[model samples]
Target: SNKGAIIGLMVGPVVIATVIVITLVMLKKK
Candidate 1:
C-alpha cells in the first residue's frame, strides 16, 4: 500500500511533465 502511494507521487510529476512537453511540442509545430 505505502509503496504504491510513493510510486504514484513520483510518477505524477513525470506524467505531468511529459504532458507539458508534448503540449509545447505541438505548439512549436505551428
Candidate 2:
C-alpha cells in the first residue's frame, strides 16, 4: 500500500499537469 501511494503521488500530478499545459498551448496556437 505504501509503495502504491508513493508512486501515485510522485507520478500522478506531473502527468496531469503536463497534459493540461500541452492542451492549453495547443489551443492557444490554434
Candidate 3:
C-alpha cells in the first residue's frame, strides 16, 4: 500500500498539471 501511495502522490498531481497546461496551449494554437 505504501508503494502505491507513493507513486500516486509523486506522479498523479504532477502529471495532471502538465495535462492542464498542455491542453490549453495546443488548443490556443489550433
Candidate 4:
C-alpha cells in the first residue's frame, strides 16, 4: 500500500541513522 511504503520510507532513514549513530558512538568510544 502507498501508506505503508510512505511510512517505510520515512522510518527507514531514521532507523538507519539510529543504527549509524550507535555504531559511530561505539567506534568512537574505542
Candidate 5:
C-alpha cells in the first residue's frame, strides 16, 4: 500500500507536467 501511494505521488506530477507542457506547446504553435 505504501509503495502504491509513493508511486502515485511520483506519477501524479509527471502527468500534470505532461499536460502543462502539451498545453504550452499548443499555444506556442498557434
Candidate 6:
C-alpha cells in the first residue's frame, strides 16, 4: 500500500489539464 498512494498522488492526470489551466484563465482575462 506504501507505493500505491505514492503513484496516485505524486504525479498523474486530472479531470482537467492543469498544464493549460493557468493559460486558459490568464488568456481569458485579457
Off by over 4 Å in 6: 1-11
Cα deviation of 11 in candidate 1 (Å)? 5.4
The clash numbers for all candidates, in the given order, read: 0, 0, 0, 0, 0, 0
Off by over 4 Å in 2: 1-11
lDDT of 3 by residue, 1-30 (tens): 678888878977787898799999999989
lDDT of 4 by residue, 1-30 (tens): 677888878977887798778888988969
Query: Which pairs of residues have clashing backbones in candidate 2?
Result: none
Candidate 2 lDDT tens digits, 1-30: 678889878977887898789898999989
**What's the lDDT for candidate 2?**
0.85
Global local distance difference test of model 5 = 0.86
Which of candidates 5 and 6 reaches a greater TM-score? Answer: 5
Better of 4 and 6 by TM-score: 4
lDDT of 3: 0.85
lDDT of 6 by residue, 1-30 (tens): 698998777566663468668898988989
TM-score of model 2 vs. true structure: 0.41
Model 1, 1-30: lDDT tens digits are: 688889879978887898788888989987
Residue pairs with colliding backbones in model 1 are none
Estimated TM-score for each candidate: 0.42, 0.41, 0.38, 0.42, 0.42, 0.32
Q: On a 0 to 100 scale, what is the lDDT of residue 7 in model 1? A: 82
Position 19, candidate 2: lDDT: 79
- Report the Cα lDDT for residue 8, model 2: 73
The positional error of residue 2 in candidate 2, measured at the CA in angstroms, is 10
* Better candidate by lDDT, 1 or 6: 1
